[PDB]
Amino acid sequence: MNIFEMLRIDEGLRLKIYKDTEGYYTIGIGHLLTKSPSLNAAKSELDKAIGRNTNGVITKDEAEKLFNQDVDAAVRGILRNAKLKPVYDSLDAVRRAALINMVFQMGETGVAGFTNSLRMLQQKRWDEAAVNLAKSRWYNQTPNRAKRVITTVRTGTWDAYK
Ligand SMILES: [Cl-]
């Protein structure tokens, strides 16, 4: 089990523009296209992202190419972030994956905002961090995915995905 497999379980694979839990135009492996109601604004973003005229449809390889870019961007955003970097440096490899999961899903800015949890992660206060992370919109909107991520953070094991 690794971050790629973990995220592919959490996000799925879809070759046709679709909407996410929030209502946004998404595609492939959790790749947010636009927060704009326009399906045409989505298709335009998508063709731009892919470099071709897609008509809102891509191949598995294209979704994988996007996924690879997004994981890389997630990792790099963590490492370039003053609030995020220290937490990550302090964690073991499983837990690191958890933070990358969150960052991919909610953005760097989003996660960086979880002030108290971040402080608990660093202090290696696992239970408390798990409890505090559950007190969020994230958790209330996508409870099963969130529980999985929270268990990973709390335990340092990959059970939830097994
Ligand atoms: Cl892109």
Ligand SMILES: [Cl-]
């Ligand atoms: Cl869910």
